[PDB]
Amino acid sequence: IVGGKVCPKGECPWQVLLLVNGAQLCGGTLINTIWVVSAAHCFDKIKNWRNLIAVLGEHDLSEHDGDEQSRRVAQVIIPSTYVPGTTNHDIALLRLHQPVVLTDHVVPLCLPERTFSERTLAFVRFSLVSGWGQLLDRGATALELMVLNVPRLMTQDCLQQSRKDSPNITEYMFCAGYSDGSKDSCKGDSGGPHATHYRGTWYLTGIVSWGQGCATVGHFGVYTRVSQYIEWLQKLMRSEPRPGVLLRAPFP
């Protein structure tokens, strides 16, 4: 996260840290006690599927304070339409091997209904994006969880306000952020939440997905449009686990 601030400990309680062989991989969002929403591109280079861990209640990477809860990722569900190395349908649904325990420091973010998200949440201008990604383009990643308030743009406006072989902004994406190079989410924030506040409650509206460098002038951050996947997610959360970590599920 570039140009944000430290998220005060416990104020981002749905933030997930994904680890592979103990190394920082991506962010994610807890949506109930056993399910995590992340980005499909986070898993393009994974070979050690059995060494994937989700950490809830994390804040400071340098210290163990007792609020952290680690779980093995039992399943990674990706839409059939996602193509590795590309941008479209950038979403993954992760089943934890054992549920996390809800506490003051571990709380799910609401996964909204599609209608509510399209009709109402899509028009809330500002939303928060968070993660332990790069503090600067070509810079070090954060030791403390960072958060940034970003405004959402209509895709016509994102296409007109952008500068520059760049991918298209599909109906499964939306732009958010700034074109002046001061504030953005970065590659190390991939998979993390874009959370929207409405009438005293926070909801999942986007996933940190892609962009150019980090906080690059003339470029906005691009986020997976979660509203397109509500039905796809709900159906999978009602399904029985299958042998093997990676599962490709038909989309729609």
């Binding site: 309680p13 003051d104 209904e113």
Partner: protein, 55 residues
């Protein structure tokens, strides 16, 4: 009705046959008698920040 100001609902809105509207809530919440407000039914409802709520 639901398209305009979320039909007055705090959370979810369903349109019915006519000028009828039903508000609904996410799991871990129940609808109040005003037919629009959602109140938590659990200790850790989704999308609420305990350290801020307890303040």
């Amino acid at each position: 009705i639901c398209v305009n100001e979320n039909g007055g609902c705090e959370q979810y809105c369903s349109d019915h046959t006519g000028t009828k509207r039903s508000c609904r809530c996410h799991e871990g919440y129940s609808l109040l008698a005003d037919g629009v407000s959602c109140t938590p039914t659990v200790e850790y409802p989704c999308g609420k920040i305990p350290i801020l709520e307890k303040r």
